[PDB]
Amino acid sequence: GFGCPFNENECHAHCLSIGRKFGFCAGPLRATCTCGKQ
């Protein structure tokens, strides 16, 4: 995905910064991140 496996901390913190409290990278390619609450 966008963050993992490259930078999970970034994707994670990034998603966490948009209100979401959890989330990971969405898709295999560096597209976006899948937040736990969209």
Q: Provide the residue ranges of all domains of the chain, joining segments of one domain with +.
A: 1-38
Q: What is the CA radius of gyration of the chain?
A: 8
Cα of 3 vs its chain's centroid, Å: 6
Elucidated via: NMR
- Amino acid letter, residue 2: F
Q: SS3 breakdown of the chain: % helix, strand, coil, rounded to 5?
A: 25, 20, 55
Cβ burial 5-35 (10 Å sphere, 16+ → b, else e): eeeeeebbebbeeeebeebbbbeeeeebbbb
Take residue 8 and report the two structure tokens written for it: 């999970």
Cα 26 to Cα 16: distance, rounded to the nearest angstrom: 14
Question: What is the phi/psi pair of residue 23, to 5°?
Answer: 160, 155
Six token digits for residue 16: 């966490």
Q: How far apart are alpha carbons 15 and 37 in whole angstroms?
A: 10
